[PDB]
């Protein structure tokens, strides 16, 4: 029966989007945050959960709304774990780009690992390639696996990975192996879920990321059956002595979690059982989302809502505004 609330939680990343749509090309990330943030906590404090957020805006001291630990809902209906992602885009939404859209997942207690604000090594796959992959292994073996559980030769194969210099490396080393790679601007939320879309030519993810992505991530590749593995990297490994001082708190956090950094995590270690609803809706027009539109007094939105235990839907809802 929180099958039943799957429409409740496609309306807060509703909110969210045109909230954040607002302050779409007008140079303030801030404010754009702090729009969609607002809207997303207000819309999920009419929800009946008791939620606490798992994956959020940042540590009370930095974040006043959406912080880790704060609890959401109305308190009726089941304690559950939320991750939010108000906005994913917030600079695209700031300079009138692609590919910003609102981001929420909801799951079981304890569902979602407590990752904390540090990088995330990230391997994902879609069904068709799921049971293949081990970050363990050489990465060019992993893409050799599963372009032999895809049915492709590996210079047909697509990687998607985040177009940053922690990646110069391995993006010829995959272009010397000879597999297309899509070297993109954005985050890797979005892109993660391509994986799993048929219509894309995207086939893995691979690359460092942020780790609370990840855990979403991994949350909705369950929900879609694919497979994916992290492994926690400090400051430092992947960008020194600045790096350091960072770098060594983000272990220090890690250890006040019993959580190891640089161990592989499988799939169920971030993302623990298959109950969990995700929904996005669209800000600007992106690979996985249409953006929102708005013609004088109505708005269009695009929602992806998926449920683990299930049907994937895609929402188009027309507000009168």
Same mark, same amino acid.
């Given at each position: 029966?929180?099958?039943?609330?799957?429409?409740?939680?496609?309306?807060?990343?509703?909110?969210?989007?045109?909230?954040?749509?607002?302050?779409?090309?007008?140079?303030?990330?801030?404010?754009?945050?702090?729009?969609?943030?607002?809207?997303?906590?207000?819309?999920?404090?009419?929800?009946?959960?008791?939620?606490?957020?798992?994956?959020?805006?940042?540590?009370?001291? #930095?974040?006043?709304? @959406? $912080?880790?630990?704060?609890?959401?809902?109305? &308190?009726?209906?089941? +304690?559950?774990? !939320?991750?939010?992602?108000?906005?994913?885009?917030?600079?695209?939404?700031?300079?009138?780009?692609?590919?910003?859209?609102?981001?929420?997942?909801?799951?079981?207690?304890?569902?979602?690992?407590?990752?904390?604000?540090?990088?995330?090594?990230?391997?994902?796959?879609?069904?068709?390639?799921?049971?293949?992959?081990?970050?363990?292994?050489?990465?060019?073996?992993?893409?050799?696996?599963?372009?032999?559980?895809?049915?492709?030769?590996?210079?047909?194969?697509?990687?998607?990975?985040?177009?940053?210099?922690?990646?110069?490396?391995?993006?010829?080393?995959?272009?010397?192996?000879?597999?297309?790679?899509?070297?993109?601007?954005?985050?890797?939320?979005?892109?993660?879920?391509?994986?799993?879309?048929?219509?894309? #030519?995207?086939?893995? @993810? $691979?690359?460092?990321?942020?780790?609370?992505? &990840?855990?979403?991530? +991994?949350?909705? !590749?369950?929900?879609?059956?694919?497979?994916?593995?992290?492994?926690?990297?400090?400051?430092?490994?992947?960008?020194?002595?600045?790096?350091?001082?960072?770098?060594?708190?983000?272990?220090?956090?890690?250890?006040?979690?019993?959580?190891?950094?640089?161990?592989?995590?499988?799939?169920?270690?971030?993302?623990?059982?298959?109950?969990?609803?995700?929904?996005?809706?669209?800000?600007?027009?992106?690979?996985?989302?249409?953006?929102?539109?708005?013609?004088?007094?109505?708005?269009?939105?695009?929602?992806?809502?998926?449920?683990?235990?299930?049907?994937?839907?895609?929402?188009?809802?027309?507000?009168?505004?």
């Amino acid at each position: 029966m929180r099958r039943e609330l799957a429409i409740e939680f496609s309306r807060v990343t509703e909110s969210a989007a045109l909230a954040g749509y607002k302050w779409l090309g007008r140079g303030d990330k801030n404010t754009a945050d702090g729009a969609a943030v607002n809207a997303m906590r207000i819309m999920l404090n009419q929800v009946n959960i008791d939620g606490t957020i798992v994956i959020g805006e940042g540590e009370i001291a #930095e974040a006043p709304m @959406l $912080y880790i630990g704060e609890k959401v809902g109305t &308190g009726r209906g089941d +304690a559950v774990d !939320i991750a939010v992602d108000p906005i994913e885009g917030t600079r695209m939404t700031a300079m009138g780009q692609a590919n910003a859209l609102a981001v929420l997942a909801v799951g079981d207690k304890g569902c979602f690992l407590n990752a904390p604000d540090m990088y995330m090594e990230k391997l994902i796959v879609g069904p068709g390639a799921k049971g293949t992959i081990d970050l363990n292994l050489p990465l060019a073996d992993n893409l050799r696996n599963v372009a032999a559980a895809l049915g492709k030769p590996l210079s047909e194969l697509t990687v998607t990975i985040l177009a940053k210099p922690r990646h110069d490396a391995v993006i010829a080393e995959m272009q010397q192996l000879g597999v297309r790679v899509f070297a993109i601007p954005d985050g890797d939320v979005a892109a993660s879920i391509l994986t799993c879309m048929p219509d894309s #030519e995207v086939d893995v @993810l $691979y690359g460092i990321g942020g780790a609370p992505e &990840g855990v979403v991530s +991994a949350a909705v !590749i369950r929900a879609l059956d694919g497979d994916m593995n992290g492994r926690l990297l400090a400051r430092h490994d992947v960008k020194n002595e600045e790096n350091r001082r960072i770098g060594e708190q983000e272990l220090a956090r890690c250890k006040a979690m019993g959580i190891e950094a640089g161990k592989v995590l499988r799939l169920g270690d971030m993302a623990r059982s298959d109950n969990v609803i995700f929904s996005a809706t669209g800000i600007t027009k992106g690979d996985l989302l249409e953006g929102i539109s708005r013609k004088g007094n109505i708005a269009t939105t695009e929602t992806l809502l998926i449920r683990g235990k299930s049907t994937i839907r895609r929402i188009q809802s027309i507000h009168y505004l």
